[PDB]
Paper text:
[name] is a key component of the DNA damage response pathway and is activated in response to intrinsic DNA damage induced by normal cellular processes such as replication fork collapse or in response to DNA damage induced by cytotoxic chemotherapeutic agents. Biochemical and genetic studies have demonstrated [name] to be indispensable for the S- and G2-M checkpoints. [name] and Chk2 negatively regulate the Cdc25 family of phosphatases thereby preventing cell cycle progression as well as directly modulating repair proteins, resulting in increased lesion repair. [name] inhibition, therefore, represents a novel therapeutic strategy to increase the cytotoxicity of DNA-damaging chemotherapeutic drugs in p53 pathway defective cancers.
V158411 is a novel inhibitor of the [name] kinase discovered through structure-based elaboration of a fragment core designed for binding at a kinase ATP-binding site. The X-ray structure of VER-154637 bound to the ATP-binding site of [name] showed that the two rings of the fragment were coplanar and made the expected hydrogen-bonds with the hinge motif of the kinase domain. The indolyl-pyridone core bound to [name] like the parent fragment, and formed the basis for subsequent molecular modeling and compound elaboration. Modeling suggested that an amide linker grafted on the pyridone position 5 would offer its carbonyl group as hydrogen-bond acceptor complementary to the hydrogen-bond donor character of the contacting water. The amide nitrogen offered the opportunity to grow towards the largely buried and structurally restrained side-chain amino group of Lys38. The X-ray structure of VER-155422 bound to [name] showed that the benzyl tucks underneath the flexible glycine loop, burying the apolar benzyl away from water, which presumably explains the associated affinity gain. It was then noted that reversing the intramolecular direction of the amide linker could maintain its hydrogen-bond with the conserved water, while also keeping the desired compound length for binding to Lys38. Much of the subsequent medicinal chemistry concentrated on improving the compounds physico-chemical and ADMET properties. This was done by varying substituents at the solvent-exposed 5 position of the indole ring which, from a structural point of view, can tolerate a broad range of substituents, largely unhindered from specific interactions with the protein. No attempt was made to design compounds which would be selective for [name] over Chk2. This led to V158411, which had the desired kinase selectivity profile and showed promising biological activity.
Numbering used by the authors: 6 to 42, 51 to 270
Write the structure that this text describes.
């Protein structure tokens, strides 16, 4: 029962690959992340995580240069692949995935962890299309012994990143994750990213601050989810909506399909 057949390749990453592995006896699947050993922290963070919208960590094995992490298998693949270019997806599915993303993110924040790289490539779908947050490689602790520390390393992926992280030496962790979730929502409902980065050097970002919502991607989005996006994609992180308030939003609580 301790033996696993590496069946299929799942994902190349920078540092590794991810293999479907199946158990010889039980036929259980796992995803196996394989790296030429950042990683100490990733394992350490994963060890603290236990939630239905976070990819389960099963364990690790040293093997000299090669680090193995054994991770929950999500047969649905990446949310990224459910987003049709230029269209997105049906609004009820976007809503359900967003509900689950917030559940995952609430959980992480409640234990003082920030993911710092939320995007569709990192949101996995299990067999019943349940969304799971993956890839704790950029994640870090922002609250410890009930004291918040401010972040100052710039980490993430530029189209998903909050504007305060390009402009401020220090910033709060939670609003940043909130922002990226908003860019994820936008992608789900429009099938495109609104900007390369949230700077006034990008015209699409200037246009959004000038409320030009008759332009794309905003014109493809119904008025109710767009009103939520108006509260999330707010340049000042202190005025940006918080998760407890997202859970009170009208579209968030709209019955759909
Ligand atoms: C492109 N596609 C049309 C090709 C096709 C093969 C159809 C992809 O379809 C699937 C289907 C199911 C999948 N499941 C997984 C998976 C991925 C992870 N990954 C992670 O948890 C993690 C942790 N860190 N990273 C990024 C990384 C990876 C390697 C090295 C460094 C960083 C990823 C954990 N569990 C999974 O189950 C990927 C995956 C892909």
């Amino acid at each position: 029962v301790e033996d696993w057949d590496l069946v299929q390749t799942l994902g190349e990453g920078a540092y590794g690959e991810v293999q479907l592995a199946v158990n010889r006896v039980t036929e259980e699947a796992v995803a196996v992340k394989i790296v030429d050993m950042n990683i100490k922290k990733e394992i350490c963070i994963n060890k603290m995580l236990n939630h239905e919208n976070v990819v389960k960590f099963y364990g690790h094995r040293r093997e000299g240069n090669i680090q193995y992490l054994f991770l929950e298998y999500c047969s649905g693949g990446e949310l990224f692949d459910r987003i049709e270019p230029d269209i997105g997806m049906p609004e009820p599915d976007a809503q359900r995935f967003f509900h689950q993303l917030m559940a995952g993110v609430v959980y992480l924040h409640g234990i003082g962890i920030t993911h710092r790289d939320i995007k569709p490539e990192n949101l996995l779908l299990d067999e019943r299309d349940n969304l799971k947050i993956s890839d704790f490689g950029l994640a870090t602790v922002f609250r410890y012994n009930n004291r918040e520390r401010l972040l100052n390393k710039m980490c993430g992926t530029l189209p998903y990143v909050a504007p305060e992280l390009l402009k401020r030496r220090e910033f709060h962790a939670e609003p940043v994750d909130v922002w990226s979730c908003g860019i994820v929502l936008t992608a789900m409902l429009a099938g495109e990213l609104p900007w390369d980065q949230p700077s006034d050097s990008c015209q699409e970002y200037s246009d959004w601050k000038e409320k030009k919502t008759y332009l794309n991607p905003w014109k493809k989005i119904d008025s109710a989810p767009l009103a939520l996006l108006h509260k999330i994609l707010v340049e000042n992180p202190s005025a940006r909506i918080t998760i407890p308030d997202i859970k009170k939003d009208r579209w968030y609580n709209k019955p759909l399909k």
